[PDB]
Amino acid sequence: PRVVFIDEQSGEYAVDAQDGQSLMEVATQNGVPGIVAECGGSCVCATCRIEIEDAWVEIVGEANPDENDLLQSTGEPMTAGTRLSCQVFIDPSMDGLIVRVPLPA
Ligand code: FES
Protein backbone atom coordinates (compact mmCIF):
# COMPACT_ATOMS: atom_id res chain seq x y z
CA PRO A 1 0.00 0.00 0.00
CA ARG A 2 0.72 3.65 0.45
CA VAL A 3 1.35 5.36 3.75
CA VAL A 4 1.94 8.56 5.64
CA PHE A 5 3.77 8.90 8.90
CA ILE A 6 4.16 11.92 11.14
CA ASP A 7 6.39 13.14 13.96
CA GLU A 8 7.52 16.08 16.07
CA GLN A 9 10.83 16.40 14.20
CA SER A 10 9.55 16.70 10.64
CA GLY A 11 5.81 16.90 11.28
CA GLU A 12 5.30 14.36 8.52
CA TYR A 13 6.78 11.24 7.01
CA ALA A 14 4.82 10.25 3.90
CA VAL A 15 5.58 6.70 2.88
CA ASP A 16 4.14 3.41 1.82
CA ALA A 17 3.95 -0.08 3.04
CA GLN A 18 3.17 -3.64 2.01
CA ASP A 19 0.54 -5.99 3.40
CA GLY A 20 2.43 -7.58 6.24
CA GLN A 21 4.43 -4.54 7.30
CA SER A 22 3.77 -2.38 10.34
CA LEU A 23 3.73 1.43 10.61
CA MET A 24 6.82 1.18 12.80
CA GLU A 25 8.95 -0.58 10.20
CA VAL A 26 8.00 1.63 7.30
CA ALA A 27 9.45 4.46 9.29
CA THR A 28 13.01 3.21 9.31
CA GLN A 29 12.38 2.56 5.63
CA ASN A 30 11.02 6.09 5.18
CA GLY A 31 13.97 7.54 7.09
CA VAL A 32 11.46 8.36 9.82
CA PRO A 33 12.82 9.19 13.28
CA GLY A 34 12.25 5.51 13.96
CA ILE A 35 12.16 6.52 17.60
CA VAL A 36 11.78 2.98 18.93
CA ALA A 37 14.31 0.17 18.38
CA GLU A 38 13.08 -1.42 21.60
CA CYS A 39 12.11 -5.08 21.14
CA GLY A 40 11.80 -5.02 17.36
CA GLY A 41 8.33 -6.52 17.47
CA SER A 42 9.43 -9.34 19.76
CA CYS A 43 6.44 -8.32 21.87
CA VAL A 44 8.47 -7.80 25.04
CA CYS A 45 8.25 -4.02 25.36
CA ALA A 46 5.47 -1.43 25.59
CA THR A 47 7.15 1.89 24.83
CA CYS A 48 6.38 1.93 21.10
CA ARG A 49 3.43 4.23 21.75
CA ILE A 50 2.76 5.08 18.10
CA GLU A 51 -0.43 6.71 16.82
CA ILE A 52 -2.33 5.98 13.62
CA GLU A 53 -3.93 9.03 12.04
CA ASP A 54 -7.54 9.46 13.28
CA ALA A 55 -8.79 8.21 9.92
CA TRP A 56 -7.27 4.75 9.96
CA VAL A 57 -7.85 3.71 13.49
CA GLU A 58 -11.17 2.40 12.35
CA ILE A 59 -9.21 1.00 9.40
CA VAL A 60 -6.32 -0.38 11.34
CA GLY A 61 -8.12 -1.47 14.47
CA GLU A 62 -6.19 -0.56 17.59
CA ALA A 63 -5.05 -3.30 19.93
CA ASN A 64 -7.57 -5.32 21.87
CA PRO A 65 -8.32 -4.54 25.52
CA ASP A 66 -5.39 -6.82 26.42
CA GLU A 67 -2.42 -4.87 25.05
CA ASN A 68 -4.28 -1.60 25.61
CA ASP A 69 -5.08 -2.44 29.24
CA LEU A 70 -1.57 -3.32 30.40
CA LEU A 71 -0.44 0.01 28.93
CA GLN A 72 -3.38 1.86 30.49
CA SER A 73 -2.48 0.36 33.87
CA THR A 74 0.05 3.17 34.25
CA GLY A 75 -2.61 5.87 34.20
CA GLU A 76 -1.46 8.01 31.28
CA PRO A 77 -3.88 9.71 28.84
CA MET A 78 -4.45 8.30 25.36
CA THR A 79 -6.20 9.32 22.14
CA ALA A 80 -8.07 7.45 19.41
CA GLY A 81 -5.62 5.31 17.48
CA THR A 82 -2.96 4.80 20.14
CA ARG A 83 -1.72 1.21 19.79
CA LEU A 84 1.52 -0.75 19.45
CA SER A 85 2.19 0.08 15.80
CA CYS A 86 5.04 -2.44 15.72
CA GLN A 87 2.32 -5.00 16.40
CA VAL A 88 0.22 -3.76 13.49
CA PHE A 89 0.49 -4.82 9.86
CA ILE A 90 -0.55 -3.70 6.42
CA ASP A 91 -3.33 -5.42 4.49
CA PRO A 92 -5.56 -4.40 1.51
CA SER A 93 -7.67 -2.87 4.29
CA MET A 94 -5.18 -0.28 5.48
CA ASP A 95 -3.66 0.82 2.22
CA GLY A 96 -2.49 4.40 2.08
CA LEU A 97 -2.30 4.51 5.86
CA ILE A 98 -1.47 7.64 7.81
CA VAL A 99 0.57 7.34 10.96
CA ARG A 100 1.40 9.76 13.78
CA VAL A 101 3.73 10.18 16.76
CA PRO A 102 2.63 11.34 20.24
CA LEU A 103 4.35 13.88 22.50
CA PRO A 104 7.31 13.25 24.85
CA ALA A 105 5.97 10.17 26.63
S1 FES B 1 8.56 -2.22 19.81
FE2 FES B 1 8.36 -3.54 21.56
S3 FES B 1 6.21 -4.00 21.70
FE4 FES B 1 6.40 -2.57 20.04
* Cβ neighbourhood burial of 59 (10 Å; 0-12, 13-18, 19+): middle
How many domains does the chain fold into?
1
> Whats the size of the chain, residue-wise?
105
Contact 45, 67 (CB under 8 A): no
CATH number, domain of 75, equals 3.10.20.30
| Any atom of ligand 1 within 6 Å of the Cβ of 43 | yes
What beta strand segments (E) does 1-105 contain? 3-5, 13-15, 51-52, 97-100
Q: Which residues are documented as binding site for [2Fe-2S] cluster?
A: 39, 45, 48, 86
Backbone angles phi, psi at 57, to 5 degrees: -65, -35
Q: How was this structure determined?
A: NMR
Domain boundaries, position 21:
1-105
| Any atom of ligand 1 within 6 Å of the Cβ of 48 | yes
What is the rounded CA–CA span in Å between residue 55 and residue 34?
A: 22
31 to each of 9, 54, 75, how far by Cα in Å?
A: 12, 22, 32
